[PDB]
Design a protein around this ligand. Structure first.
Ligand SMILES: *C/C=C1/C(=C/C2=NC(=C\c3[nH]c(/C=C4/NC(=O)C(C=C)=C4C)c(C)c3CCC(=O)O)/C(CCC(=O)O)=C2C)NC(=O)C1C
Ligand SMILES: *C/C=C1/C(=C/C2=NC(=C\c3[nH]c(/C=C4/NC(=O)C(C=C)=C4C)c(C)c3CCC(=O)O)/C(CCC(=O)O)=C2C)NC(=O)C1C
Ligand SMILES: [Cl-]
Ligand SMILES: [Cl-]
Ligand SMILES: [Cl-]
Ligand SMILES: [Cl-]
Lengths: 492, 492
């Protein structure tokens, strides 16, 4: 059905099963007729037999059906309508999620559990609005979510440029192992999963060791499956199921962090026992996720601003000194190390008049002329940067542990003079806070579905590679070029 | 051959003619054989008969050919090699431009006129490096270029988002008419022209009323024309020829302003008499163009930074006031006009609890509910902006003279409350410094090829449209949303 070969392309949006903590009824575009339903619809709503081919008013009752249909008008959108505490025909009270996607009305029922959403959320959002840095926001959010929603572990996953995830914050029970500073490969969250996570803010798993409920029909006469993209009861991949089971995790709740309309990362809650949050608590958690997302976005913007301002101030100081020095070359020889304040780097060097001066982690004196010649050939009077030097210069491999990434800044419009910034390979700068000799119980699919193997797979994928140069890094580097080229032109 | 219907697609890169101020010889990839040559090659180099099918060493002489070939190695690139003051076989001295494109070596000859390039350029670049604003750089550059290169008119053309050009700076002889603040449509510089302008920094027209020199063969046996994309002697469209002649302009020199690898605009020099600049003066002008480009880029970056910082400071002041006010709605009613400092706008309004408050140029009280309802339908809790309101709401047309553009900011996560920013249609804000009753002598193609008709055509194209909202505008608007939504959530 699915394994480690075709799970990168697994159609998770159309599993044909839901989770047992609720029941689902699929109706036509207009919600006149019941096209599909979950096997457990009878056991929960107290109805007998097959509901398929019956009318809406027949199953739910004219009273309820009218309220649902009017909530679709107020909706429009694919964003699901939340209707807490609604009465059926036979009195029973349910929390109802209602959405419409691919002209099919999907209705999800939960036994109602009536918390005030606005109250819980407002308390949480107040405690994060004060945060003055990305670091202060992310560190306090895991601590706050764990305290409020009472999960055993709360992680924040940040997606790197390569799609890999880094655990950037953690609140856990003291007995559980830490994943803080641990990376996981892009493959561990395939593209189709990232799509749904971008479409649904919130994502719940009541019981990883739960019995999934089939949807009937599993496929319709057209050969069309039920697309559960926006359904909160949508069942989960048996691959991820096995991953959570191998970890000692029985329940999960993830929140999507959207920043500049991109999946930035996930707030992920793990529980060691089964756990469902009521619709009200979910509404609050979702509201919190939106505000967390918005606040992180502004802090990201503020951080970028400060970095570029700091770089502009640093370069002004330099240009001021260059006006009061006769010989610019000896100023650059005295000053080049100070340029390490502009761009995060493990080392910086000056290649001027076929002479080399290094500071921090740089290639050995031997390798610099070869590097300088290479830079001169491909630079073309512009900033040149790679995070994978060995892919460009295969003999660079020998010193990757010291310098695996390089950003080159030409400092002369004419002569082949360069300011070089270096970064150690990413595995050298690992501040892993986890357990080396902590092993995991495996399942049918093998030891691939453990954090130990995931981390080991990622570490292999980034061998001989440094932290990629951010757009901020390349923007500053370009501003630094213009400044140095500009003042170098003045001194002739 | 070409007219006002097929000149938007005119193949200007392959005209099959050069300008009479130099001679051109096209050779094979290796520069072993003369494949094509200009008709005037004989009259300038003092050679007799057809040069096509002869060898390189035969025509130019083994001595010269060796020097040219070694300059291609040092080159590589499509960027043309400049070789001032070179001796032919018969003593004659020439300035030689040498490039290779589509595996065809093109050699351009000018009678040498030996200025020091580095000296002229360094003097010019020094006078612009001090500029502390975009406005100070652009205003002094026309004045400086005119003073140094002695053209009759120097304009700077800035390209708008729609491809239209605005004259943002001018230095002219006092008798000539001013084009300052005048716009021209995108069509006046077709896409294929903008491509070449992005490939060649400098572009010269010695004589608009000059006799073009044919290249022989005009087309080769393959059916391939000579691609003169990087040739400085490349002849110009007869459409533009007629434009310059209608204007009283006999010679032109344009410099490409590249900012963030995009054609930002042109430094354009017009002369009323024929005028060619020697290779040295061109080299200097080109160097100046690169530094002008780089300096404008950093100033653009600095301006963006300051604007976003100023917006962040303004919003901090507001959030501070909102903490010390009980009722946020009345604070917004007292304060909304102050938000006009964040985003350039001719008017701003507050739509709160189905009540309207306006300040500056806004739609009439009548039209606001219709607008509010429209914004509520399409906004979807996000910043919504248009520069062409009538295209979205056709009855808006009536008040376009007051408000033709609108940027909407939702200030509530729940209620349909909005902060609206308005801009008058662009023709209302015209500070044209030109002559209304100044008419132009027309040619075969008609009065279309006059600044009077170009301006009139542009004014038609931007009717009922305001100045588009810049990315800076929308970035601030998004930061303002998060702030207002954030503090509105706190007050419940
Ligand atoms: C070949 C397919 C695989 C695969 C598919 C899926 N992963 C999904 C969700 C998911 N994966 C992770 C990854 C982790 N890696 C770790 O090392 C680690 C913890 C130490 C985790 C948690 C995460 C974080 C998530 C989502 C959040 C979470 O629950 O933690 C999904 C979609 C699940 C869904 O609910 O729809 C698919 C499909 N995972 C693999 O490992 C492989 C090989
Ligand atoms: C249908 C084609 C047309 C056309 C084609 C070309 N224009 C070209 C250059 C060029 N046009 C302008 C436009 C101006 N519009 C003004 O109102 C105005 C002055 C008041 C000007 C100068 C400019 C500025 C330029 C280039 C710089 C310059 O010399 O001023 C070209 C390419 C020319 C070349 O050298 O390759 C083409 C082709 N122009 C039209 O007007 C039309 C209809
Ligand atoms: Cl589809
Ligand atoms: Cl600076
Ligand atoms: Cl081609
Ligand atoms: Cl702010």
């Amino acid at each position: 059905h699915v394994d480690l070969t075709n799970c990168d392309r697994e159609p998770i949006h159309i599993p044909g099963y839901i989770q047992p903590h609720g029941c689902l009824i699929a109706c036509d575009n207009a919600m006149r007729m019941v096209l599909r339903h979950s096997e457990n619809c009878g056991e929960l709503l107290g109805l007998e037999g097959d509901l398929n081919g019956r009318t809406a008013e027949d199953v739910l009752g004219k009273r309820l059906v009218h309220d649902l249909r009017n909530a679709l008008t107020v909706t429009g959108t694919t964003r699901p309508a939340m209707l807490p505490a609604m009465e059926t025909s036979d009195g029973r009270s349910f929390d109802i999620s209602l959405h419409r996607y691919k002209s099919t009305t999907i209705i999800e029922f939960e036994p109602s559990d009536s918390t005030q959403p606005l109250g819980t959320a407002r308390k949480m959002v107040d405690r994060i609005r004060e945060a003055d840095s990305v670091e202060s926001l992310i560190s306090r959010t895991t601590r706050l979510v764990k305290a409020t929603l009472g999960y055993d572990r709360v992680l924040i996953y940040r997606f790197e440029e390569d799609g890999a995830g880094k655990v950037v914050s953690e609140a856990k029970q003291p007995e559980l192992e830490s994943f803080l500073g641990q990376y996981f490969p892009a493959s561990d969250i395939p593209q189709q999963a990232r799509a749904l996570y971008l479409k649904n803010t919130l994502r719940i798993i009541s019981d990883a060791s739960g019995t999934p409920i089939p949807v009937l029909p599993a496929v319709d006469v057209s050969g069309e499956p039920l697309d559960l993209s926006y359904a909160h009861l949508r069942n989960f991949s048996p691959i991820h199921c096995e991953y959570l089971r191998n970890m000692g995790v029985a329940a999960s709740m993830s929140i999507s962090v959207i920043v500049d309309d991109a999946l930035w990362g996930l707030i992920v809650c793990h529980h060691c026992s089964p756990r469902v949050l009521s619709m009200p608590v979910r509404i609050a958690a979702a509201m919190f996720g939106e505000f967390f997302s918005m606040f992180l976005q502004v802090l990201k913007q503020k951080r970028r601003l400060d970095t570029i301002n700091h770089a502009h101030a640093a370069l002004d100081r330099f240009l001021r000194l260059a006006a009061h020095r006769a010989n610019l070359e000896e100023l650059l020889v005295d000053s080049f190390q100070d340029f390490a304040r502009l761009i995060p780097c493990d080392g910086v060097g000056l290649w001027v008049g076929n002479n080399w001066h290094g500071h921090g982690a740089t290639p050995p004196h031997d390798a610099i002329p070869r590097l300088a010649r290479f830079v001169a050939s491909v630079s073309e009077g512009r900033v040149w940067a790679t995070h994978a030097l060995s892919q460009a210069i295969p003999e660079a491999e020998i010193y990757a542990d010291t310098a695996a990434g390089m950003l080159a800044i030409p400092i002369s419009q004419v002569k082949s003079d360069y300011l070089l910034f270096f970064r150690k390979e990413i595995v050298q700068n690992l501040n892993w806070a986890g357990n080396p000799e902590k092993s995991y119980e495996t399942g049918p699919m093998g030891d691939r579905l453990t954090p130990r193997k995931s981390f080991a797979i990622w570490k292999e994928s980034v061998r001989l590679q440094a932290q990629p140069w951010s757009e901020a890094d390349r923007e500053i580097a370009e501003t630094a070029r213009i400044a140095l080229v500009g003042v170098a032109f003045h001194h002739s």
